[PDB]
Design a protein around this ligand. Structure first.
Ligand SMILES: Nc1ncnc2c1ncn2[C@@H]1O[C@H](CSCC[C@H](N)C(=O)O)[C@@H](O)[C@H]1O
Length: 327
DNA sequence: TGGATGCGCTGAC
DNA sequence: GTCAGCGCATCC
């Protein structure tokens, strides 16, 4: 994550829904905002969240009386994506995990914050012939909010990640916000190789599969894209090896394959998956952030997470717009 | 809502 | 045809 000198969100309160690791919290706090509520029902996510912020998030949002939620200015919510991801079955709202957005609407309808900042996977934008995004848009409009949605690729904002997500920023209409803009892309100067840990700390992640098939030659020049170098097994998810001279493939929460949830990389002649600390780094997390003691849970958590830097630029722009109040 | 890995199918070229 | 995906069902 980057340092923010002009703290555009100073004096603003926000809630961290579907908190997870608290990526939205790191991003908004870096801009000066104060978190006044967090909700996360996963046992392990609650532990790491508490480990880093000192508080246990409240559980299952579907059972929380929205009236009990503290007053806040900005509602943050990177809601469940298994039901909308290109990698899943796409049952969308038909999925028991795909109706959480309506819980968000319920809370918005009651607390009416100034801003609603949501995040979901790229496919959410086109799922069900665009009907899914349209439903969210109309719901927010009904609630008297403007709706700004755009897919941003993390590689355009200083993080070597193919992470592509749809970001939705909603402003309560009475605020008459007309200058909100998504961050403009800038040149990537950091690549996977730059965030890797020393070899001595990741020897245990090195795997030598005799069914490894190098398909492409290693590149010597860094490039802002994923560069596949080979595969193991049939080359399915978690069975693809990439160049550290390129960018990291999207992390996943329930991913499989021998290089589960991170993908495989060619590092000094060896092939290995990423270390939880490396996952944290490719997601924009500071080294000061404490990962969960279970590597399996840590991989899952970062796989579900957001790229901090991207949320930082968005948060900064949200604040920039809320502060432009000329006479 | 354990940890691990082989897998298969969709979306966007 | 190419390839990537906050995933899935199953095994212990
Ligand atoms: N009904 C529910 N109540 C509370 N949390 C829920 C929930 N259903 C799913 N979640 C949590 O929603 C999260 C969605 S992933 C969001 C991760 C978050 N942005 C962070 O930066 O990491 C998951 O951690 C999941 O455990």
């Amino acid at each position: 994550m980057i340092e923010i000198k002009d703290k555009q969100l100073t004096g603003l309160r926000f809630i961290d829904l579907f908190a997870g690791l608290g990526g939205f919290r790191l991003a908004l706090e870096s801009c000066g905002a104060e978190c006044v509520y967090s909700n996360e029902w996963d046992k392990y996510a609650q532990e790491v969240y508490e480990m880093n912020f000192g508080e246990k998030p409240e559980g299952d949002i579907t059972q929380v009386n929205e009236k009990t939620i503290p007053d806040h200015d900005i509602l943050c919510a990177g809601f469940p994506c298994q039901a909308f991801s290109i990698s899943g079955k796409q049952k969308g709202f038909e999925d028991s995990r795909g109706t959480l957005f309506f819980d968000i609407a319920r809370i918005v309808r009651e607390k009416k914050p100034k801003v609603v900042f949501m995040e979901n996977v790229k496919n959410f934008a086109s799922h069900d012939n665009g009907n899914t995004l349209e439903v969210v848009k109309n719901t927010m409009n009904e609630l008297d909010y403007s709706f700004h949605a755009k897919v941003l690729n993390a590689l355009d904002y200083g993080i070597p990640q193919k992470n592509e997500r749809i970001y939705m920023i909603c402003f309560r209409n009475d605020l008459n916000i007309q200058n909100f803009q998504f961050p403009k892309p800038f040149e990537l100067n950091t690549f996977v190789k730059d965030l890797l840990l020393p070899d001595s700390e990741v020897e245990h992640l090195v795997i030598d599969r005799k069914d490894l098939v190098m398909t492409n030659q290693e590149i010597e020049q860094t490039t802002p894209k994923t560069v596949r170098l080979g595969i193991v097994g049939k080359g399915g998810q978690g069975e693809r090896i990439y160049s550290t001279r390129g960018i990291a493939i999207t992390l996943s929460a329930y991913g499989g394959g021998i290089f589960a949830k991170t993908g495989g990389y060619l590092v000094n002649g060896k092939t290995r998956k990423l270390h939880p600390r490396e996952c944290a780094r490719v997601m924009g997390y500071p080294d000061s952030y404490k990962v969960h003691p279970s590597t399996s849970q840590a991989y899952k958590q970062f796989g579900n997470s957001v790229v901090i830097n991207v949320l930082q630029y968005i948060a900064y722009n949200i604040g920039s717009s809320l502060n432009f109040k000329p006479y």
